[PDB]
């Protein structure tokens, strides 16, 4: 490529794999999001707040395929895998596993950065640290409060609980 | 000082105590403020309501320091100790301490108060009248009504209590 | 803390040094700017250039904890040291006290940039770099252009060199 | 007086020797206003500056002869006495005049108050408060720093001290 320069082979690997990443979150989020439109489980605002993790994910999958393709390097799609459940339990549950998630994510983009800054990439690096890196902390933060504020109203009645939090918080 | 007239070596030392007890009023309400923006504590009303306590303390102190000024007095700045814990347990709790708070700040300012009348200084009684002391007693019974309300809550439910005060009354 | 993710004890802790460092300076200039406003020095608008930079270390104070929470870190909140003197000189002195101010400030968010590089901590690195680090050096540029155009001034006359000073540059 | 309630004759009289000493300090500044106007001195702010504190200190009279009415009193006026020098040889000298004339009238207040307090009048006491007493120390504050900054340019070169504070300070 005419325009590739001081663009890592592993830089340009590690790029496909975390838009993959990206896809599947963002397919996850999409489950969970379903999941409380349900008429049995009708969280409307939650189901709400996930889409919004969903279409983010989505966002940032496609940030990183023009990335790959501004530096020159070559865009290689693979399967998005399905999400593990179908099923999330309830409002607590979905989103503790959306903590899990995000720190797994922020993990993979944490060693994606590692290796450009090993390669002595500054163009990739700076890409990665914004927005990328600053969303993750500002997410798993926001999800760290949410579950906290939930867990409070939980102990005393769950079925109260997701419907105060669903119009309060969510809402 | 060629403007000094009818100021007291003690009420000029007064002055200086106090911008310094206000000055650690408004450092004890940032550890609260703080406190409560952890993950593990997530009520940002609290957190908001006690920033607000903070910057109101903070001005009281710079107002004392320019009245310090404008009567020809020195103004002399000691060291501001830190707040007494760094862990405030829950919302009443920490609404409970800052009432005892202000009351002994209350205290001080009617001590300085005193000595400005005993030794004849209208200027400086006038100006401690309003708006220090007016202030005080309309927080005092702020604070006081915030008290009660949160302690007929609490006897339900204590999460659910912090929960709904963060969002009903300090929202 | 469910939140905290790559980061640190050292940063941890020199993150709460720093903010103990920021009250510090920001007590400082509180001081000057006080002195500034005493009926016998009188230089209105150095009194306003030193409440502007006390506002600002107080802002960059409070944004650290700010960020200590966003990690996951614990805040601790030490003593405020009171500012090394109580009467600046004048002019020329107060400018010169800060530009050394600014510097060991501005050393001391050097060194915790080295912690966290050396920590591998990109997140902390960006959100140190800016503002925190430009902010330093732009202040101690304009700190040391003041300092030499009352420099000239002060050779004439050091009585009219405040007083022009402090009306056509400070105002 | 069909009127008259917890009025005494010693706060009376005192009302009305308060006034003849406000019409006095006035016509000093009428004085030394015109003095400055003066194809000779011709220092047109500093002539502003006094033709302000001048309309003031009338405005004051004024309002003393209207408070004696509200109370039931009766008004009593004397000749006004004319100012003790025609010239006032330069603008440090007059504004040091000011000061001490500022300072010989806040203490007729201050006295004033005193006889009030001791006769228990809080209409009285309230009104003397603000904004004649609070008029006074920022009036006084306001000269003392005039005196300071002039002084300093005074110390190299008088002639361009005038001209300079004319134009920077009292323009």
């Known amino acids: ?21 990206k896809f599947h979150s963002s397919y996850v989020y999409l489950s969970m999001a379903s999941y409380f439109n349900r008429d049995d489980v009708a969280l409307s605002n939650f189901a709400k707040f996930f889409r919004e993790r969903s279409a983010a994910a989505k966002a940032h999958a496609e940030k990183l ?34 903590l899990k998630l995000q720190k797994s994510v922020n993990q993979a983009l944490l060693d994606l950065h590692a290796v450009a800054a090993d390669k002595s990439d500054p163009h990739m690096t700076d890409f990665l640290e914004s927005p990328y890196l600053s969303e993750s902390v500002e997410t798993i933060k926001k999800l760290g409060d949410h579950i906290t504020s939930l867990k409070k109203l939980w102990s005393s009645h769950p079925g109260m609980a997701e419907y105060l939090f669903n119009k309060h918080t969510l809402g």
Not at 4 to 21: I, K, S, W
Not at 66 to 92: I, M, T
């Open 1 to 21: 490529s005419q325009v590739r320069q001081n663009f890592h082979q592993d830089c340009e690997a590690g790029l496909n794999r975390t838009v993959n990443l």
């Open 65 to 98: 395929i023009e990335y790959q393709n501004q530096r020159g390097g070559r865009v290689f799609l693979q399967s998005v895998e399905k999400p593990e459940r179908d099923d999330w339990a309830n409002g607590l549950e979905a989103l503790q596993t959306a």
